[PDB]
């Protein structure tokens, strides 16, 4: 999957999304704080947000929400339902355009 950025830092994710993206662009990359896991770096209102993806070994989810068997499945749900990712305080973060 081309939105999957394997060896990229949150810093280079922000580099790419601010120079190569538009609002609504996103990518998944691996976690820094939790080695072996992933993170979604999404672009909203000219800045980048990072969302941790929970891999429980039984499913994937966004530490709450629908659960998925694969990462690409998760990304497709959120792409196909742009109202479904809300950040605690109500605000919606749309995953609209894969960065790549």
């Amino acid at each position: 999957r081309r939105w999957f950025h394997p060896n990229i830092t949150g810093v280079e994710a922000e580099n790419l999304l601010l120079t190569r993206g538009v609002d609504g662009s996103f990518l998944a990359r691996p976690s820094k704080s939790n080695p072996g896991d992933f993170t979604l770096s999404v672009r909203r209102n000219g800045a980048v947000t990072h969302i941790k993806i929970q891999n429980t070994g039984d499913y994937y989810d966004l530490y709450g929400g629908e659960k998925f068997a694969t990462l690409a499945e998760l990304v497709q749900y959120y792409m196909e339902h742009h109202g479904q990712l809300k950040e605690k305080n109500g605000d919606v973060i749309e995953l609209k355009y894969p960065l790549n």
Binding site: V11, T49, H50, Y63, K88
Partner: peptide, 7 residues
């Protein structure tokens, strides 16, 4: 980084 609070 600009990390969302997962909660």
């Amino acid at each position: 980084g600009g990390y969302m609070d997962m909660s």
